[PDB]
Structures are given as C-alpha cells and as structure tokens.
C-alpha cells in the first residue's frame, strides 16, 4: 500500500514532501535527501517561490541517476492572480520552465479565489471567481499533456460537487488540511462517492507554522497509541490519514524526520486503537482569514468552506 490510484489511472505516491515554508537553499537539499531516503512525490506551487531551487534539485537527482522523470509525482499549483483562462496555460508554462519539467504530473488550482493578474491578495484586487471559466482552460492543458492530471485545492465538498457537475475532465485531487485534529469526515466521504482522492495537506498539524497554533501531535490518543505501536506521534498521524485512503505531504526539513516519515506503510493502527480517533477535539488550523473580508466572495469562514468548519 505505497500509493493511490487517480480517476485518470496514474498512481500517486501515497507520502509527499510538503516544501511550503521551505527557505533559500533549504528546500533543495530537502528534495535531494527525500528523494534518495525513497520520496517518489513532491508537493509544490508557484506562490511559494521556490520553484527554481526545486527543479536544480530535480535536475541533480536526475543526472546522478537517483530516479528517471517518470519515476516521479511533481505536483505544482495555480495561484490566485492566474484564474483567468487565457492566463492559466502560461502560469503553467512558467511553473514547468521553472521546475525544467515538460509536464507536471499533477496541477491544482490553488484557492477558489480570484484576484487581478500580477497583483496581490487585498480587497481592490478581488475579481469573483468564475471557477468553470478557469477549469475550462485547465483541461485544455491537461488535454495538451501539460499536466497529468488536475485537480482542485481547499474547496469544500460544496465547490468540489458543484465543478464536478460542470467538468468534462473530472478533478483528479482535491487538496486539503487534514489530519487528527481535522479528520475531514465529510469531505471524505464526499470524494469517495465521487472519485476523487484527497490529499492531505498539513498532516501533522504543521506544528511549525507560528500563527496556526497546532498542537495535533500531543494529543492523548495520538501519543497513547504511538507508545502502544512502537512509533512516534508523527508516524501515527500520518498512517491515520493513509489508512483512510489519503495521501499525506510531511513537510519536514530534518534528514531523520524525512525518513521517519516514510515508516508509515507496513504496520497498522488496530481497528480498536483507530475508533479512539473519534475522542480528539476538531478545529480547521488554516482557516483563510487572508480571503474572507466583508469585500471577498467569502464574507464568512462558513460561506469559504460551507459549513465546513
Ligand atoms: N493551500 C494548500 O494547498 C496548502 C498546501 N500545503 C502543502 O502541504 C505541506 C504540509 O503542510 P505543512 O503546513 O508544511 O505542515 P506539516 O503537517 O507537514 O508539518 C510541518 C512541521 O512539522 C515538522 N515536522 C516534520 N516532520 C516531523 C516529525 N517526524 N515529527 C515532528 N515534527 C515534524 C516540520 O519541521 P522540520 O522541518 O524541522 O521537521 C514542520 O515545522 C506543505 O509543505 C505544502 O506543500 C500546505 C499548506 C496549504
Ligand atoms: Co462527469
């Protein structure tokens, strides 16, 4: 159980490296070191800059002869300013050239948020989404072999069916927060009745990231089973998520913690440990507080996620 299958029949690793806050020069040798540790799957997006570091890593792997291209799950990501149609292919363009990829195997529209092109999130930039118009121009270069596959990120079941109703290519992924602190049961269920798998971003709660105040990893039922398996917190948390058939992105900068993050595909969390689950209290960490204002499309945390919150 080392990966999932897409609606479009390619295999996705099941273990990304999430490389969101990832400095100068950190994030290469991250790519480098998981990819060698055995990482078959890299999470990227064009907002997080670090693209051209990325791919010098890529290129290296490459030339050494660690992997081939098609050894890999490059993923990148639309960012706001580029949801208009004729904008998404060269946004692509740009990520690929960046990356030195002909294609990514994966392509996500980031945010069911729009803003005009090359400014940035602030309320005189706010353009309403017209998220069809934008997939439209997303299946074209999935259509040209660009990307793989294509996908969605952060939208709640709502916007997800609501695209599904409308597409002629069906989203591959949707990509979101997930993790013990939360399950996204939902969102869950609603992928598995429509074929789309879920990734989970922030698997372990992203304890790093200041201003999201994630303590997922000490909870009591994460930490009681971790001592009865053997494993750590982490390890837990991620065969939580992969046990409910998602895909998990560990960001991590830490040789030791990238491999132990990896250790997650031959053992089990038992059906009896597993219900404990169910006792940890829910709270979404990244709640969007940058695209709900009494001017965005989003007046509400409800009215981003519909409810789901
Ligand atoms: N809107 C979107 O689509 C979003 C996508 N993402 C994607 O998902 C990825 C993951 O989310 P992220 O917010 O990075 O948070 P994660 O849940 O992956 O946790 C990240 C933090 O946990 C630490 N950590 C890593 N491994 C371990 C371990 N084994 N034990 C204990 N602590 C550990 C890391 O530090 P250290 O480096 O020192 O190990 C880092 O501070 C991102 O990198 C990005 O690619 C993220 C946010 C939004
Ligand atoms: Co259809």
Known sequence: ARHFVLNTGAKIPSVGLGTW???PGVVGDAVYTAVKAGYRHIDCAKVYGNEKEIGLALKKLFEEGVVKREDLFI???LWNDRHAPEDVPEALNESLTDLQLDYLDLYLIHWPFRVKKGTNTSPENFITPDIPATWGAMEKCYDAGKARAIGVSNFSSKKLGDLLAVARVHPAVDQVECHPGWQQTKLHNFCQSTGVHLTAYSPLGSPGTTWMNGNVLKEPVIISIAEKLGKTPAQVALRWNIQ????????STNEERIKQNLDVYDWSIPDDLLAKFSEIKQAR???????????????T???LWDGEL
């Open 285 to 299: 960490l990244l709640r969007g507080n940058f695209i709900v204002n009494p001017q965005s499309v989003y007046k």
């Open 244 to 251: 409910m058939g998602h895909s998990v992105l560990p960001k």
């Open 301 to 303: 945390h409800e009215e």
């Open 75 to 77: 993923t990148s990501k």
């Open 21 to 23: 806050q990832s400095d």
